[PDB]
Structure 1
Amino acid sequence: EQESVKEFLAKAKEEFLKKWESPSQNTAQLDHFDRIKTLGTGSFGRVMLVKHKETGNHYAMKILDKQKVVKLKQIEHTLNEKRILQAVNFPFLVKLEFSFKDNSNLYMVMEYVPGGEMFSHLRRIGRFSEPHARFYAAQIVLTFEYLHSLDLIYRDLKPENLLIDQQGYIQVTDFGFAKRVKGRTWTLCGTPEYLAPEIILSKGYNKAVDWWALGVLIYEMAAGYPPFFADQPIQIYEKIVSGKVRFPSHFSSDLKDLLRNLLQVDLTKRFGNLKNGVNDIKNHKWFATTDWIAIYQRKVEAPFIPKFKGPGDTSNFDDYEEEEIRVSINEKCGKEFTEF
């Protein structure tokens, strides 16, 4: 690589390691914010729009119930997410602004991105043109180059985790499965449609699983549906391990060639995991029109700008039942979350 790229990544790792070894803790509290609206809900918690009472700034507050985080690997993942997010810095990653805990919950307060999830926009339009898909894919390539150079694996790439910001660019959210890994790792995690074969087969795996998931994401953006789907996960898994994929006729030859090399079932032959690393992807013909420095500097005009009215507009997110944020009189699971 060029010396400027090598020095950029060396400085990035220096800055990450300093925050990694001295994590920030306890930088706000709950009654510093007004609650506005629930933006999403899951098995362990929810994400809410909030407004800081002194500054008037809007944020996305993720709330995790400590008593639903029971398994050893669930606790490990919860601690991974906050330690990594407070240490990273890159143009296409959502920024963590505050974190804290109380008797019942863990809290991560992020910048609020009002344009909504890529998933919503993709399902509304049907599919993205190849130049449109390529604009988003280039941002993921640069983000994985950054994360992998810090010895981080992301492990949750899917359209629901890619938010579109006020300039039409991607902000990646949800680091719940992200982990710092020297060598291999073994946990079964991720959504079935995006899982690489070596996760399904219970092997020790590495950063190659993120490049497989990029292949799935690019296919889904350009086709409108993912390459492997079925009603039961076991059926999805059979398709993934088989080594077969059918491409729509409208795909360009260059797109098909890139996807065959990302959706390579043999991890030792998969693009992103060869001796030239990420540069086999950056130099592929499908990316020949991409100005990689212009993308990083956000100087390229985006395919579209989301419609919203201001920094507190919630019209690009959907409606959920509004439930209490109960905080018990007694502390729960204090020992497990001491480092949070």
Structure 2
Amino acid sequence: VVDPDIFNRDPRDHYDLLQRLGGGTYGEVFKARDKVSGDLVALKMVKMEPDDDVSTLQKEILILKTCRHANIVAYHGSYLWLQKLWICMEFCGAGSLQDIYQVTGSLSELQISYVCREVLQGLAYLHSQKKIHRDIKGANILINDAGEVRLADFGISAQIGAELARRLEFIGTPYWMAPEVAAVALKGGYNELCDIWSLGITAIELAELQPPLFDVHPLRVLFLMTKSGYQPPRLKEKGKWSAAFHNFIKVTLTKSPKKRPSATKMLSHQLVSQPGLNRGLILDLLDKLKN
């Protein structure tokens, strides 16, 4: 079973499919309008042939289903009919932050600070449920018309969760296994603080329209990060940003995960606990986006 609450009916009987969303970057996601109501929803359709493995699909749905938080994109349910699975989610009218800043340019420090607080609130909830996003970036941070910040796309989170569960289910005999090998089999070799690092990179991305080292080959970036003298990235223009923002970058981009602060600890940081942070900052950004 993909889900004990699947609607075994075609969603086109309840929804008018309006247009495609995100250019396929997030999959086959459509904007859709309810028929008896005006309510708008996002519908992501996945082909479902019988001989396909649906293990990764089932985890993603369960991750989205089990989240009830104001900074995580809302889940409505799933439709299964005629070998098509439609995942029904809240429609975030402004797209991702990457779509936004490609139009408005770099965000103000206050807008970045608001985003970082809202993502940290979502990450704190996720981590408290023993979940790891593992794909925090501008493209996976959606903004709705109400100016709210919602984390989205747990696809990578599902791939990893099903991948580790696959190897565990067919683990065979671990009775001769070494404790560190068993740890990596169960826990995967890292923890939820990888999300804190990704947020730090995302804050730079919102400041500069690019993550650091974006022109470097992917395998060369992985190669540089695994050397003893690795230097965590920094903001380009020092005089453009406050010391609080610089310190926020410095602590979120701590090399050693054993010293990187948690999502909850980071919520007490000077940058994201300042009084001038409110949704008006985002609604102001959407006004600029409307031009």
Would the TM-score normalized by the shorter structure come out above 0.5? yes
Structure 2 unaligned residues grouped into runs of 5+: 167-187
Aligned to 1:24: 5
Q: Does structure 1 residue 241 correspond to structure 2 residue 226? A: yes
Aligned to 1:62: 44
Cα deviation 1:93-129 (Å, max 9, x = unaligned): 2212231223432110112221222112212232112
Distance 1:84 1:53, change over 3 A: same
Query: CA shift at 1:164, angstroms?
Result: 1.5
Q: Which amino acid aligns with 1:176?
A: G
Matched position secondary structure for 1:153: coil
Query: CA shift at 1:215, angstroms?
Result: 1.0
Q: Does structure 1 residue 229 correspond to structure 2 residue 209? A: no
Aligned to 1:177: 156
Taking the aligned partners of 2:200 and 2:50, their CA distance within structure 1 comes to 33
Query: CA shift at 1:286, angstroms?
Result: 2.4
Task: Pick from 235, 253, 257 the counterpart of residue 247 of structure 2.
Answer: 257
Aligned to 2:175: none
Query: CA shift at 1:47, angstroms?
Result: 0.4
Q: Does structure 1 residue 206 correspond to structure 2 residue 184? A: no
Q: Which amino acid aligns with 1:25?
A: I
Q: Which amino acid aligns with 1:174?
A: D
Matched position secondary structure for 2:76: strand
Taking the aligned partners of 1:44 and 1:287, their CA distance within structure 2 comes to 29
Q: Which amino acid aligns with 2:73?
A: V
Distance 1:186 1:82, change over 3 A: closer
Instruction: Judging by fraction of residues, say which structure has more helix.
Output: 2
Distance 1:41 1:180, change over 3 A: closer
Taking the aligned partners of 1:301 and 1:66, their CA distance within structure 2 comes to 42
Cα deviation 1:224-275 (Å, max 9, x = unaligned): 3212323521122234335212432223222222222211222112121xxx
TM-score (norm 1): 0.67
Taking the aligned partners of 2:255 and 2:128, their CA distance within structure 1 comes to 23
Q: Which amino acid aligns with 2:243?
A: S
Answer yes or no: is the 8 Å Cα contact 1:50–1:61 preserved in 2: yes
TM-score (norm 2): 0.77
Answer yes or no: is the 8 Å Cα contact 1:186–1:204 preserved in 2: no
Taking the aligned partners of 1:56 and 1:300, their CA distance within structure 2 comes to 24
Task: Pick from 281, 286, 289 the counterpart of residue 306 of structure 1.
Answer: 286
Aligned to 1:106: 85
Aligned to 2:179: none
Query: CA shift at 1:62, angstroms?
Result: 0.3
Distance 1:186 1:157, change over 3 A: farther
Distance 1:167 1:181, change over 3 A: same
Answer yes or no: is the 8 Å Cα contact 2:251–2:261 preserved in 1: yes
Taking the aligned partners of 1:256 and 1:267, their CA distance within structure 2 comes to 19
Q: Which amino acid aligns with 1:225?
A: Q
| 1:1-40 correspondence runs (5 A) | 23-26=4-7, 28-32=9-13, 33-40=15-22
| 1:38-117 correspondence runs (5 A) | 38-42=20-24, 45-67=27-49, 75-117=54-96
Q: Which amino acid aligns with 2:90?
A: E
Matched position secondary structure for 2:30: strand
Cα deviation 1:48-105 (Å, max 9, x = unaligned): 11222333432110011235995x6xx4321111112122211122212231223432
Taking the aligned partners of 2:9 and 2:157, their CA distance within structure 1 comes to 24
Distance 1:258 1:40, change over 3 A: closer
Q: Does structure 1 residue 121 correspond to structure 2 residue 100? A: yes
Structure 1 unaligned residues grouped into runs of 5+: 1-21, 188-202, 273-277, 309-314, 317-340
The alignment covers a number of residue pairs equal to 260
Query: CA shift at 1:27, angstroms?
Result: 6.2
Q: Which amino acid aligns with 1:160?
A: A
Query: CA shift at 1:305, angstroms?
Result: 5.2
Q: Does structure 1 residue 136 correspond to structure 2 residue 84? A: no
Query: CA shift at 1:162, angstroms?
Result: 1.7
Taking the aligned partners of 1:256 and 1:231, their CA distance within structure 2 comes to 24
Cα deviation 1:119-171 (Å, max 9, x = unaligned): 12212232112111001110001111111111111122111122222232212
Q: RMSD of the TM alignment (CA)? A: 3.4
Distance 1:226 1:150, change over 3 A: same
Taking the aligned partners of 1:240 and 1:143, their CA distance within structure 2 comes to 27
Task: Pick from 178, 189, 205 the counterpart of residue 220 of structure 1.
Answer: 205
Distance 1:133 1:27, change over 3 A: farther
Taking the aligned partners of 1:170 and 1:134, their CA distance within structure 2 comes to 12
